[PDB]
Amino acid sequence: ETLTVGFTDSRKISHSCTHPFHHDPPVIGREKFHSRPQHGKELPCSTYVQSTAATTEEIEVHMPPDTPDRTLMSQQSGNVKITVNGQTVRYKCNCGGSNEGLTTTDKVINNCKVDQCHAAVTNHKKWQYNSPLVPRNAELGDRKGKIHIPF
Amino acid sequence: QIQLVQSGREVKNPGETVKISCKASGYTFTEYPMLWVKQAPGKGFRWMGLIYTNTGEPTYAEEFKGRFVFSLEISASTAYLQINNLTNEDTATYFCVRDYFISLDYWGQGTTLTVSSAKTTAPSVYPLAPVCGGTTGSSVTLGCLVKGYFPEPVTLTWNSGSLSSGVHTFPALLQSGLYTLSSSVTVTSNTWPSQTITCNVAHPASSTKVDKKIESRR
Amino acid sequence: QAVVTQESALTTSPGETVTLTCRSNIGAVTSSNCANWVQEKPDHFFTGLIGDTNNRRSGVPARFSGSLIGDKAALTITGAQTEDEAIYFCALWYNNLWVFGGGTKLTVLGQPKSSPSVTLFPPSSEELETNKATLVCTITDFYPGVVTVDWKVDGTPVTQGMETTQPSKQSNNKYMASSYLTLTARAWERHSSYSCQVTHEGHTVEKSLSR
């Protein structure tokens, strides 16, 4: 449910970044993968090799960005409660008073509705693929990384 | 359903420590933390902090970081307030409260502390029966005078608490360095003096318990 | 480091609609302040009404609703009742702590007046065995909650020796109070007519004992 990537430096200190990522290999195939004669006529074709070695092809990676989560906000009678749960959360509301910021503590917005507010968890420790199905990081322009891909 | 019942009110001379309990009923202790609020005699209501009844971490209001310490007998659904090195200006009432629904939904009864220097004097319990003559109505009012004790509190019941309807207990008041309290009870004229009516008084600070049956003057 | 402000007192009549407000000194109140409304009835009796601006605690009548009006949190009582006469406090959240308002004393028309029930007791005898005598005058079930208690030993207004508590609210929302006149075993035996006079919403009630 969470992806962790780390390493060890020269000063013997280990740093690791953790990102919430739902990992469950799903169905992915376009055939039955089965020959085919052992000996026959030789013809030119193309296939994806099984070499894991970091060469040729590459994908774009970036910060998760601020991962949106609607479960962070809760309607406390006539006010909105933002339950942090030991995470850095970026909030924004339509209502008056405090309507922006980066909170580390539990916050409450007086006289507001859940639909009039937006909250997201800020991870900046881990890397994530530049996916069109995931939103772009708000406090970031075109800052991105790249990793070599197998097959 | 939800009942937060608090300890009874204490008297303590400056410098002492107090542990005020809050016993929770009706909810699962663990999913709802506790607010401790101080309503000072004049001043109004003030948040003293909150305790995460799950992890156990307390937050103190800045006004309360120091002499105040929140803790919990998790196991018994109790939260507790401890005020150490009591200052005289800590006399007030402290409420425990449940934080839920983006605010506070239930408040306790309150535990009132009176920080005050003074020895220990046991109360004198006096029966109050009607005037020597007549007293003929559809009902009748008896009384009980708990005079000259220190410190607070005293508890008072009628017939071990089985007689609670028609009772007026009057808040203790300080007079000449001692507290005095009183209570009245009203019953039908057929009940008394046919059936026994007894005043029950306890003064914890002196380990004094007095049962005084109200007797007719003649 | 924020100051919540509320109306001091508001008076209404049964059946009316009344609005209490809660103002923050730092800015408009918003839904992230999670306005809470708490009611204090006599006897240090607290109950929560609304939380998170507009969530009504369970078992709180529907005549109570919360909202944000302008830049402040508001509590509206629609069809105020006599039972709603109490102190209402608002609380606002400020990212890390709660700040309570000063509370609004609300008065609602109702509860027809009720005369006091006065009783005067003589010093008991076990107490006269202490060389002391205390006449107790108890006054209960009166409303409005304001009285005048005057003692008169032998026809003469006592003026020293008496102590009268402050009216305390009973459960039914009526009040009570007691007055004490302490004499000496001896002062007791001297004078002969004691009387506790209670004045309430214009009528007087005198309860006299005769030694």
* Residues B183, B97 contacting (CB under 8 angstroms): no
* Residues C48, C58 contacting (CB under 8 angstroms): no
- The whole-angstrom distance between B63's CA and the closest CA on chain A is 19
Q: Provide the H-helix boundaries in chain B.
A: none
Backbone angles phi and psi of A80, in degrees to 5: -110, 120
Q: Residue B134 contacts by C-beta under 8 Å, 6 or more apart in sequence? A: none
Q: Which amino acid is at C208?
A: S
Tokens of C17: 């609609």
Strands B34-40 and B44-51, bridge-based pairing: antiparallel
**Whether the bond into C116 is cis, omega within 30 of 0:** no
Please state, in angstroms and rounded to a whole number, the distance separating the CA atoms of residues A5 and A118: 29
* Residues B136, B46 contacting (CB under 8 angstroms): no
* Residues A77, C51 contacting (CB under 8 angstroms): yes
Residue appearing with tokens 């204090």:
C40
Please state, in angstroms and rounded to a whole number, the distance separating the CA atoms of residues A25 and A9: 32
Neighbours of C190 (CB within 10 A): 11
Tokens of B53: 């009844």
Q: What share of chain A is helix, strand, coil (3-state, %, to 5)?
A: 5, 35, 60
Q: Do C34 and A110 make contact, defined as CB atoms within 8 angstroms?
A: yes
Kindly identify which residue of chain A lies nearest to residue C91, measuring between CA atoms. A110
Q: Residue B6 contacts by C-beta under 8 Å, 6 or more apart in sequence? A: B20, B21, B22, B23, B95, B96, B108, B109, B110, B111
Find, among C105, C101, C19, the residue nearest to C68 by Cα: C19
Backbone angles phi and psi of C90, in degrees to 5: -110, 155
* Residues C89, B26 contacting (CB under 8 angstroms): no
Please state, in angstroms and rounded to a whole number, the distance separating the CA atoms of residues C133 and C135: 7
- All residues of chain A having their beta carbon less than 8 Å from the beta carbon of residue C33 are 79, 97-98, 108-111
Residue A114 in 3-state DSSP?
helix
Q: What angle do CA B49, C52, C30 make, to 5 degrees?
A: 95
Most C-contacting residue of B102, B185, B217 (CB-CB within 10 A), to test interface? B102
* Residues C173, B166 contacting (CB under 8 angstroms): no
Strands C203-210 and C45-51, bridge-based pairing: unpaired
Cβ neighbourhood burial of C105 (10 Å; 0-12, 13-18, 19+): middle
Cα–Cα separations (whole angstroms), residue C112 to C108, C109, C197, C204: 12, 9, 23, 18
Neighbours of B40 (CB within 10 A): 14
- The whole-angstrom distance between A80's CA and the closest CA on chain B is 7
Find, among C181, C191, C178, C206, the residue nearest to C123 by Cα: C181
CB contacts < 8 A, B to C, total 134
Backbone angles phi and psi of B110, in degrees to 5: 105, 145
Which strands, in side-by-side order, build the sheet including C203-210? C156-157, C148-153, C193-200, C203-210
Backbone angles phi and psi of C206, in degrees to 5: -115, 125
Strands C104-108 and C9-12, bridge-based pairing: parallel
Chain centroid to CA B113 = 10
Cα–Cα separations (whole angstroms), residue B42 to B45, B91, C11, C90, C149: 9, 11, 21, 17, 26
Tokens of C119: 């009783």
Residue of C28, C34, C50 with shortest CB distance to A108 = C34
Whether C54 contacts chain A with CB within 8 A: yes
Whether C9 contacts chain A with CB within 8 A: no
Find, among B107, B110, B99, B103, the residue nearest to B40 by Cα: B110
- The whole-angstrom distance between A57's CA and the closest CA on chain B is 48
User: Virtual CA dihedral for B89, B92, B94, B99, nearest 10 degrees?
Assistant: -90
Find, among C54, B48, C76, B201, the residue nearest to A79 by Cα: C54
Q: Do C48 and B37 make contact, defined as CB atoms within 8 angstroms?
A: no
Chain centroid to CA C64 = 22
Kindly identify which residue of chain B lies nearest to residue C177, measuring between CA atoms. B170
Please state, in angstroms and rounded to a whole number, the distance separating the CA atoms of residues A126 and B142: 78
Whether A113 contacts chain B with CB within 8 A: no
Please state, in angstroms and rounded to a whole number, the distance separating the CA atoms of residues A3 and A63: 13
Give the resolution in Å: 16.9
Q: Is B50 left (phi over 0), alpha (psi -120 to 50) or beta?
A: beta
User: Neighbours of B (≥3 Cβ pairs closer than 8 A)?
Assistant: A, C
Whether B31 contacts chain C with CB within 8 A: no
Residue of A78, A81, A96 with shortest CB distance to C66 = A78
Secondary structure in 3-state letters for chain B: CCEEEECCCEEECCCCCEEEEEEEECCCHHHCCEEEEEEECCCEEEEEEEECCCCCCEEECHHHECCEEEEEEHHHCEEEEEECCCCHHHCEEEEEEEEECCEEEEECCCEEEEECCCCCECCEEEEECCCCCCCCCCEEEEEEEEEEEECCCCEEEEHHHCCCCCEEEEEEEEECCEEEEEEEEEEECCCCCCCCCEEEEEEHHHCEEEEEECCCCC
Please state, in angstroms and rounded to a whole number, the distance separating the CA atoms of residues C73 and C23: 7
Whether B121 contacts chain C with CB within 8 A: no
* Residues A108, C33 contacting (CB under 8 angstroms): yes
Please state, in angstroms and rounded to a whole number, the distance separating the CA atoms of residues B64 and C154: 56
Q: Do B102 and C53 make contact, defined as CB atoms within 8 angstroms?
A: yes
Please state, in angstroms and rounded to a whole number, the distance separating the CA atoms of residues C85 and B99: 25
Tokens of B198: 């007894």
* Residues A141, C60 contacting (CB under 8 angstroms): no
Cα–Cα separations (whole angstroms), residue A118 to A95, A99, A101: 12, 10, 11
- All residues of chain B having their beta carbon less than 8 Å from the beta carbon of residue C50 are 103
Neighbours of C179 (CB within 10 A): 22
Q: Do C53 and A111 make contact, defined as CB atoms within 8 angstroms?
A: yes
Secondary structure in 3-state letters for A16-80: EEEEECCCCCCCCCCCCCCCCCCCCCCCCCCCCCCCCCCCCCEEEEECCCCEECHHHEEEECEEE
- The whole-angstrom distance between B188's CA and the closest CA on chain C is 15
Q: Residue C77 contacts by C-beta under 8 Å, 6 or more apart in sequence? A: C12, C17, C18, C19, C20, C63, C64, C84, C106
Task: List chain A gaps (C–N > 2.5 A) by preceding residue.
Answer: none
Q: Do A76 and C52 make contact, defined as CB atoms within 8 angstroms?
A: yes
Residue of C30, C34, C72 with shortest CB distance to A76 = C34
* Residues B130, B170 contacting (CB under 8 angstroms): no
Neighbours of C4 (CB within 10 A): 27
* Residues B123, B154 contacting (CB under 8 angstroms): yes
Whether A110 contacts chain B with CB within 8 A: no
Kindly identify which residue of chain B lies nearest to residue C32, measuring between CA atoms. B102
Q: What angle do CA A75, A77, A81 make, to 5 degrees?
A: 40
Tokens of C86: 């109490």
Give the containing element (helix H, strand E) for B19.
strand B18-25
Tokens of A116: 């009039």
Backbone angles phi and psi of B158, in degrees to 5: -120, 125
What one-character DSSP code corresponds to residue A105? Answer: S
Whether B106 contacts chain C with CB within 8 A: yes
Tokens of A107: 């916050």
Residue appearing with tokens 């409450």:
A108
Q: Residue B108 contacts by C-beta under 8 Å, 6 or more apart in sequence? A: B4, B5, B6, B22, B95, B96, B97, C46
Residue of B45, B105, B180 with shortest CB distance to C89 = B45
- The whole-angstrom distance between A131's CA and the closest CA on chain C is 32
Please state, in angstroms and rounded to a whole number, the distance separating the CA atoms of residues B170 and B179: 12
Neighbours of C128 (CB within 10 A): 17
Output the DSSP codes for chain C.
---EEE-SEEEE-TT-EEEEEEEESSS---TBT--EEEEEETTTEEEEEEEBTTEEPTTS-TTEEEEEETTEEEEEEET--GGG-EEEEEEEE-SS-EEE---EEEEES-S--B--EEEEEPPPHHHHTTTEEEEEEEEEEEBSS--EEEEEETTEE--SSEEE---EE-TTS-EEEEEEEEEEHHHHHH--EEEEEEEETTEEEEEEEE-
Q: Do A99 and C30 make contact, defined as CB atoms within 8 angstroms?
A: yes
Q: Do C138 and B141 make contact, defined as CB atoms within 8 angstroms?
A: yes
Strands B208-213 and B198-203, bridge-based pairing: antiparallel
What one-character DSSP code corresponds to residue A142? Answer: S
Most B-contacting residue of A81, A109, A112 (CB-CB within 10 A), to test interface? A81
Please state, in angstroms and rounded to a whole number, the distance separating the CA atoms of residues B167 and C152: 27
- The whole-angstrom distance between C48's CA and the closest CA on chain A is 11
The residues in B 32-91 lying below 8 A from C, measured between CB atoms, are 35, 37, 39, 44-47, 59, 61-62
Neighbours of C48 (CB within 10 A): 26
Question: Which residues is A27 bridged to in the sheet?
Answer: none
